[PDB]
Amino acid sequence: EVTGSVSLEALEEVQVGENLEVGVGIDELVNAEAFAYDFTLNYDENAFEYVEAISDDGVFVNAKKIEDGKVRVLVSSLTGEPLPAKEVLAKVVLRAEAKAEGSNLSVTNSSVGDGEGLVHEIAGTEKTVNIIE
Numbered sequence: 001e002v003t004g005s006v007s008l009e010a011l012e013e014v015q016v017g018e019n020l021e022v023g024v025g026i027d028e029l030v031n032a033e034a035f036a037y038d039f040t041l042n043y044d045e046n047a048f049e050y051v052e053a054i055s056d057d058g059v060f061v062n063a064k065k066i067e068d069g070k071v072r073v074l075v076s077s078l079t080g081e082p083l084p085a086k087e088v089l090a091k092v093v094l095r096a097e098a099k100a101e102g103s104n105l106s107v108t109n110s111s112v113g114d115g116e117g118l119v120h121e122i123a124g125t126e127k128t129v130n131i132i133e
């Protein structure tokens with residue numbers, strides 16, 4: 001069986017009018033390697049606005065706003081090397097629009113594609129952030 005979960009890194013606290021780089025990756029992945037990674041970032045759209053999605057360097061990152069507060073992201077390797085675990089693979093840049101305590105950031109509908117080409121779903125996660133000033 002192939003199991004795994006999502007990694008999510010972001011500062012605990014950010015100022016209105018500053019960018020939050022929500023850093024998404026793979027925390028753990030058992031019995032497979034990922035060459036493709038597909039996930040969705042949910043945020044509170046009254047608190048944030050989506051700016052863009054960028055890599056942490058060696059991978060392909062394509063994002064698409066499904067609606068305000070929902071961004072689907074596709075990450076694939078560009079080098080033929082597996083996407084490593086325990087690092088940011090893609091960053092979702094969110095502009096802080098309005099003060100909010102305990103603003104939710106969740107990664108849902110997460111799955112990976114392995115060397116054989118098979119697709120395995122992995123567990124999402126969540127985190128909160130404060131928007132201050």
